[PDB]
Design a binder for this molecule. Structure first.
Ligand SMILES: [Mg+2]
Ligand SMILES: [Zn+2]
Ligand SMILES: [Zn+2]
Ligand SMILES: [Zn+2]
Lengths: 112, 81, 142, 262, 171, 97, 36, 539
DNA sequence: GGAGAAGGAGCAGAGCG
DNA sequence: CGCTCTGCTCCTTCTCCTTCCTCTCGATG
RNA sequence: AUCGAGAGGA
């Protein structure tokens, strides 16, 4: 019930100025703040205090403090995040990078 | 798991981008060319021509959330973009 | 142990003599792979011919290697090699231990114990005694 | 601040929305799996109007005089009138439309009859009319059987998902619930025969076009929806606004708490 | 000792080599690199079991450039020594402070310090073998050796042999 | 010119991953390093002239890999090591399936 | 920069350190893009 | 050389003090740097990152180009607290039985079994701390929950524990019967904690052991992390880290000297804090307490934390966003005679930005001519790259008329017509403000845009500046064109409406033109038809 | 200076003796 | 019903928190 | 060169 009420509140604020943004954009945002079984803010005490990759979290608003916790608990990052691959300088798993291309030798022979 | 692939048979615009870029890069590196040349020197443009005639010998490995994957041949994919 | 096909294959403690037979078979297949494009002296030349018609003569070190392994092969006749394989493996002997006995000369259980420390302690001497002279007779047949 | 929250949300090839950890945020993107670039406002005629007007615009009766189909509309005239088999089909269509009418009354309590839905049916039909200058002063060759079954056939091909299991199929039906209601509204037997006097060739062209249009409109996998949604809220946020700051930050201590009691 | 194991090697192909004839070429490139190789883990790599049925496993185009990766799996025949192992080898060369003997594909240095105390170098012989004891060991003769630990190197692999034992004597 | 945060946010929305990588690597900060498989620390002594490699503290000479990372990133890990944090980098995902 | 030397000044501070100042002048003509 | 791979996962942890010694290639002993040019072997020696022209870099040669630095080793006289974990040490010691190594509570208490059941390590540790912190005694005999009359003889010490308090950089414990806790004592306590307790406390056996939270030896970063400074006339002014390390060595040497010579107990106590102070400030020069390490110039010392923390640090200032080459910035201006996806690029810019085209049989002739023109002319190139990496510079050579190109060579071709380029109007508020256009070279120093494209950019021709980015790889060119090309964003997901449209005079003109009253004489019409490039020749 | 985390301190009721 | 014990409620502390670019200027080792 | 401060834009 809170989620739907949250959407209604956000929509009114945006619509009050006469602008218009598609429904799905709010739906995603309002959803994200509630997937954790509660009203998780998007501040330093909300989204940041997640269970995601530490290397990703450390770039938001607390960096050195987070790194210390990660070392102490020997946390591990799967590098599946976007920012993680940005730091490592690799192709992020997004858009053109969410899949792999391979060469089919069978078709290669056929194309002759 | 080629049987019962659950992904779309249409080529998402993103694979269209990478395939054209990828194949274009191969052509620029003097890779064998499958289609006849019509005076077309821009390596990207040949790739678009090749994609039109389904002469690109590449297969897309789409990944799923759990780490599994499905393989789609460029021939199989439906180009509607 | 596990192979790359996901099969839990145990360590293949392949014997010296049977190796050359596999190498022979493998080398013939290479020649066949080119084509579509026994006494120790006989086998030594036979493998020598196989390598020369399957390679470019570059790895002569391996040519010398296979020649010398043939010079010291003990169970050459593959058909009779199956006997020594069954004689040792049927007893549950550790395959690494199987490799040495099927690849090294031995006549007595004490001799087998003497050469192999792992056998000095827990091996059943009676089985070696029965097998070793059976293998010693088999070895003489070559 | 907003972007970092949603930075890692994307649509995977199974048409689901997950963050970097793989947690599922929305099982189907935007509750319809439809891209925002291929959606536009359209009317839902079945919601508004008086019940009599609704029945007049949709109900067809081949047996009575209240809603007789004018024989001049089609090459087949009295051959259709009196045919109980075709009457049964019309009853099924009207039955479904009645359910949609009362159903949508619950979805949209305020009665608004305009929402963004993919594939502009109205525009496609006009393109059909001008496609080969269909003569709207002569009887057509359509049959109620072709009209009714064609609509059902199209609904089957509106495939957003591909899983053959029941669970996926159940979502597939729920994915195109609202859109299919629109389709039935503007492809009803009466309206197509009277308002939009299409030929059989023209009608088949429209149906074949809608599916092609719809499939292109489905959201593409790998889309970085998260940031896209974050920016789309950030951009208008530059133009209330302190309230938005008061929202994104939970800030239990609000400025002007209030109630609305009915 | 000799073993059978499934080896995997990653080959990279330049795009120009993406003609139909690549498949045979890929196999050709595999054989030259794998055949006759050295390593501290598996020692010497001798040959590939099942030359055919090679698991090409599709070419993964590297995003960086046009070259593609090939994860090729295959059975291989390898030699791995073990401390205390017994080998019926032969003498390759004679020397004053030991002998160069042949152990599988491997060379073993049988130091005089690990030979019978009664066996002494005799420079007057040709080849310069030891004959001061009953263990006459020359290049043309046979020698069974005991591997006193393996000493692997980047370019090759060798070990230390011994003869001062109740076994692993001459011939 | 600074390709700041919002600049990369736009690329993410467009989904042009390859361009984003190209801007962050080919344009600047390109750097090749070596790493130990046993331990994920850039401690490899890369005797390129001799084609010799070693990770003192592991006595490893076979588990050496080449990795391309931003030069700026390379500092971050070193400073983290100076902080007594061990950013072990591994080229093989532990989770198989 | 692109211009000509207008006046070169040579002097010293109270510390006796020799200073050189060079005034270079050039004519700027309204081009495309100049703000007005 | 070695196999090429890609990073798959990152595992964090703490250095093992033995490992640090194993990693290091040289022990740092002297705070002194020099005499005139020779260097003390015990600090920043050639075995670390060598200075330019010195191909040692621990026998790695390659100068600074293709060789990183290597870490040093410092043996602290006494253990010191790690600043980042001081709070965590407080919690852990509040949970351990203080000279037993066991936990104040055990599995025989139902409350932990719920806590020990938590899969999340962090919450597990927090939940345990909330309970054990109230347990002020570790009695040996603990009554069993199943059998109240039966007790479990677990607590080894059987004594009480003091209330640990944070005192600056050290801990003070109030015994319920008060003294400063010894750093060495804590190390002993941690070394007595079983690996079973590590897991319950959220520690990893092989990556994070509680004892490792206290530093016994310091890794010394190599010069590249703290570069040699020669800003003035061969003046040092070394980076703060270099000077800060020297202070640590001075404190370390003094502490070792004092303890060794005469053991003036009280002096040792102060020297212990000084070493604790210098190392703490070195790692973090901003603590809760007053102590603020100041540089000789008077400014605060830039500790490691400052370098990373905050914007312009080592994360947001160099990793997330970084300065890039192959870019330009200038002033824009409208141009009706240019299509949407096009842009005007001044010759003065196109003559500088370059693209590494690859020589192939399909374009060797055109590239050859470009090299013949040379960088002086617009349609030319700057560099010819041989297969070996011989970056020939056409700017400083007459070889432009002599070089014969070879397949596989790269040519730094100038920007030419139709080459895609990515634009941006700072700030990049939303997606639409970053789009890809096509290049048409114009002879004046500004960027020409079609009027109607300013609506998405939110741009204005009152002097607004606008950036340009050039792709380099053939892959990126295709990726930009097929995803970021102007026409692909005509319809925006922002509001489901065409973001671009006819604006300003063109919009005003149309109203008059389509007005029912407007008629056009023949003479005028003939001109109009010709302007329409798509006219079919039919009047 | 604000807002949230954190830690002490006092208190009152429920069970105990 | 006092003793005790315990959790609850109250009441102070105690941190740590905000696009892009181009010029000039004084001051340090 | 950096840092610090300032002015001015987008
Ligand atoms: Mg402006
Ligand atoms: Zn290592
Ligand atoms: Zn070095
Ligand atoms: Zn204790």
């Amino acid at each position: 019930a809170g989620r739907a009420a949250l959407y209604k509140e956000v929509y009114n604020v945006i619509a009050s100025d006469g602008s218009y943004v598609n429904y799905r954009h709010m739906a995603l945002l309002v959803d994200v703040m509630t997937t954790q079984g509660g009203l998780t803010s998007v501040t330093r005490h909300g989204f940041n205090r997640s269970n995601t990759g530490a290397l990703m979290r450390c770039s938001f608003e607390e960096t050195v403090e987070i790194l210390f916790e990660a070392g102490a608990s020997a946390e591990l990052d799967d590098c599946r995040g976007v920012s993680e691959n940005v730091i490592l300088g690799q192709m992020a798993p997004i858009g053109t990078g969410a899949f792999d291309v391979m060469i089919d030798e069978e078709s290669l022979v056929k194309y002759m | 798991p080629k049987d019962q692939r659950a992904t779309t048979p249409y080529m998402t615009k993103y694979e269209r981008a990478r395939i054209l870029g990828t194949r274009a890069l191969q052509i620029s590196m003097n890779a064998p060319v499958f289609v006849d040349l019509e005076g077309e020197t821009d390596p990207l443009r040949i790739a678009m021509k090749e994609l039109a005639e389904k002469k690109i010998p590449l297969v897309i490995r789409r990944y799923l959330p759990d780490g599994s994957f499905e393989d789609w041949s460029v021939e199989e994919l439906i180009v509607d973009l | 142990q596990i192979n790359h096909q996901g099969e839990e294959e145990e360590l293949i403690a392949l014997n010296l003599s049977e190796a050359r037979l596999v190498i022979k078979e493998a080398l013939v297949e290479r020649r066949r792979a080119f084509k579509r494009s026994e006494t120790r002296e006989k086998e030594l030349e036979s493998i020598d011919v196989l390598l020369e018609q399957t390679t470019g003569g570059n790895n002569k070190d391996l040519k010398n290697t296979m020649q010398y392994l043939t010079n010291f092969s003990r169970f050459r006749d593959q058909e009779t090699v199956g006997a020594v394989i069954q004689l040792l493996k049927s007893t549950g002997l550790h395959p690494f231990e199987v490799a040495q006995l099927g690849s090294l000369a031995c006549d007595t259980a004490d001799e087998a114990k003497t050469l192999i420390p792992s056998l000095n302690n827990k091996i059943s001497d009676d089985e070696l005694e029965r097998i070793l002279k059976e293998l010693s007779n088999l070895e003489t047949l070559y | 601040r907003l972007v970092k929250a949603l930075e890692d949300i994307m649509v995977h090839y199974d048409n689901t929305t997950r963050n970097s950890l793989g947690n599922v945020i929305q099982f189907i993107y935007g509750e319809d799996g439809m891209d925002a670039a291929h959606i536009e406002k359209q009317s839902l005629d079945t919601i508004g109007g008086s019940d009599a007007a609704f029945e007049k615009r949709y109900r067809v009766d081949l047996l009575n005089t209240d809603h007789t189909l004018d024989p001049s509309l089609l090459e087949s005239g009295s051959e259709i009138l009196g045919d109980l088999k075709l009457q049964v089909l019309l009853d099924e269509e009207y039955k479904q439309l009645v359910k949609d009418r009362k159903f949508l009354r619950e979805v949209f309590v305020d009665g608004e009859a305009n929402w963004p839905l993919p594939v502009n049916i109205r525009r496609i039909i006009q393109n059909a009319q001008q496609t080969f200058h269909i003569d709207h002063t002569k009887p057509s060759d359509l049959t109620i059987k072709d009209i009714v079954l064609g609509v059902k056939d199209l609904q089957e091909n509106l495939l957003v998902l591909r899983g053959k299991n029941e669970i996926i199929q159940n979502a597939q039906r729920d994915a195109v619930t609202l859109f299919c209601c629109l389709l039935r509204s503007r492809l009803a037997t009466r309206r197509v025969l009277q308002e939009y006097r299409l030929t059989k060739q023209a009608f088949d062209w429209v149906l074949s076009n809608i599916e092609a249009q719809f499939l292109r409109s489905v959201v593409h996998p790998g889309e970085m929806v998260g940031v896209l949604a974050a920016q789309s809220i950030g951009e208008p946020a530059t133009q209330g606004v302190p309230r938005l700051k008061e929202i994104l930050n939970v800030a239990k201590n609000m400025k002007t708490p209030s109630l609305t009691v009915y | 000792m000799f073993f059978i194991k499934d080896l995997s090697l990653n080959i990279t192909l330049h795009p120009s080599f993406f003609g139909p004839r690549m498949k045979q070429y890929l196999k050709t490139k595999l054989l030259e690199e794998v055949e006759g190789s050295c390593t501290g883990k598996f020692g010497y790599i001798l040959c590939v079991l099942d030359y055919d049925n090679i698991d090409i496993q599709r070419g993964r185009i590297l995003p960086t450039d046009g070259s593609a990766e090939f994860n090729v799996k295959y059975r291989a025949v390898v030699f791995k020594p073990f401390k205390g192992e017994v080998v019926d080898g032969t003498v390759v060369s004679c020397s004053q402070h030991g002998f160069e003997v042949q152990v599988g594909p491997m060379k073993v240095f049988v130091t005089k310090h690990l030979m019978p105390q009664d066996l002494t170098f005799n420079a007057g012989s040709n080849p310069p073998s030891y004959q001061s004891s009953e263990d006459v060991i020359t290049i043309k003769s046979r020698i069974r050796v005991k591997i006193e630990g393996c000493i692997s190197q980047v370019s090759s692999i060798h070990a230390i042999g011994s003869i001062k034992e109740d076994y692993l004597g001459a011939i | 010119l600074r390709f700041g945060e919002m600049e990369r946010d736009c690329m993410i929305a467009h989904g042009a991953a390859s361009f984003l990588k190209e801007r962050l690597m080919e344009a600047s900060d390109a750097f090749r390093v070596h790493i130990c498989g046993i331990c994920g620390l850039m401690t490899v002594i890369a005797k390129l002239n001799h084609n010799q490699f070693e990770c003192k503290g592991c006595d490893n000479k076979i588990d050496i890999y080449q990795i391309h990372i931003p030069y700026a990133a390379k500092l971050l890990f070193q400073e983290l090591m100076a902080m007594n944090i061990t950013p072990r980098l591994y080229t093989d995902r532990s989770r198989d399936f | 920069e692109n211009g000509i030397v207008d006046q070169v000044l040579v002097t010293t501070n109270q510390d006796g350190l020799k200073f050189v100042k060079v005034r270079v002048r050039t004519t700027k003509i309204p081009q495309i893009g100049d703000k007005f | 050389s070695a196999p090429l791979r890609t990073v798959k996962e990152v595992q964090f942890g703490l250095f093992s003090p033995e490992e640090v010694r194993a990693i290091s290639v040289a022990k740092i002993r002297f705070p002194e740097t020099m005499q005139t040019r020779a260097k003390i072997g015990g600090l920043n020696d050639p075995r670390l990152g060598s200075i330019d022209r010195n191909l040692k870099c621990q026998t790695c040669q390659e100068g600074m180009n293709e060789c990183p630095g290597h870490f040093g080793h410092i043996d602290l006289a006494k253990p010191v607290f790690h600043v980042g974990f001081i709070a965590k040490i407080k919690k852990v010691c509040e949970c351990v039985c203080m000279h037993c190594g066991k936990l104040l509570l055990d599995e025989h208490n139902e409350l932990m079994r719920q806590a020990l059941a938590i899969k999340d390590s962090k919450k597990r540790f927090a939940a345990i701390w909330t309970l054990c912190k109230t347990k002020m005694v570790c009695e040996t005999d603990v009554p069993s929950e199943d059998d109240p009359t039966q007790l479990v003889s677990r607590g080894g010490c059987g004594n009480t524990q003091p209330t640990i308090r944070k005192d600056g950089l050290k801990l003070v414990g109030s015994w319920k019967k008060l003294r400063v806790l010894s750093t060495e004592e804590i190390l002993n306590i941690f070394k007595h904690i079983s690996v079973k307790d590590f897991t319950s406390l959220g520690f990893n056996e092989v990556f994070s052991r509680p004892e490792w939270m206290i530093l016994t030896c310091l890794p010394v970063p190599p010069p590249p992390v703290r570069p040699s400074i020669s800003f003035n006339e061969s003046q040092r002014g070394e980076d703060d880290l270099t000077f800060k390390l020297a202070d640590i060595l001075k404190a370390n040497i003094s502490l070792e000297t004092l303890e060794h010579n005469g053991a003036p107990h009280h002096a040792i106590e102060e020297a212990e804090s000084l070493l604790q102070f210098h190392v703490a400030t070195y790692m973090d020069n901003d603590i809760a307490g007053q102590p603020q390490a100041l540089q000789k110039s008077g400014r605060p010392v830039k500790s490691i934390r400052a370098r990373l923390k905050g914007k312009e640090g080592r994360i947001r200032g160099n990793l997330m966003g970084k300065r890039v080459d192959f870019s330009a910035r200038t002033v824009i201006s409208g141009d009706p005679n240019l299509e949407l996806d096009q842009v005007g690029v001044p010759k003065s810019i196109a003559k500088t930005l370059t693209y590494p085209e690859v020589v192939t049989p399909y374009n060797i002739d055109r590239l050859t001519q470009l090299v013949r023109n040379g960088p002086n002319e617009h349609p030319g190139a700057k560099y010819v790259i041989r297969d070996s990496g011989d970056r020939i510079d056409l700017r400083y050579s007459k070889r432009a008329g002599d070089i014969q190109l070879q397949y596989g060579w790269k040519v730094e071709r100038h920007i030419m017509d139709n080459d895609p380029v990515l634009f941006n109007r700072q700030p990049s508020l939303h997606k639409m403000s970053m789009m890809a256009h096509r290049v048409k070279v114009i002879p004046y120093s500004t960027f020409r845009l079609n009027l109607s494209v300013t609506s998405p950019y939110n741009a204005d021709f009152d002097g607004d500046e606008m950036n340009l980015h050039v792709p380099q790889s053939e892959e990126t060119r295709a990726e930009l064109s097929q995803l970021c090309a102007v026409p692909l964003q005509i319809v925006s997901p922002q509001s489901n409406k065409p973001c671009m449209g006819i604006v300003q005079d063109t919009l005003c003109g149309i109203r008059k033109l389509t007005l029912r009253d407007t008629f056009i004489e023949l003479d005028q019409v003939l001109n109009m038809l010709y302007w329409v490039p798509d006219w079919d020749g039919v009047i």
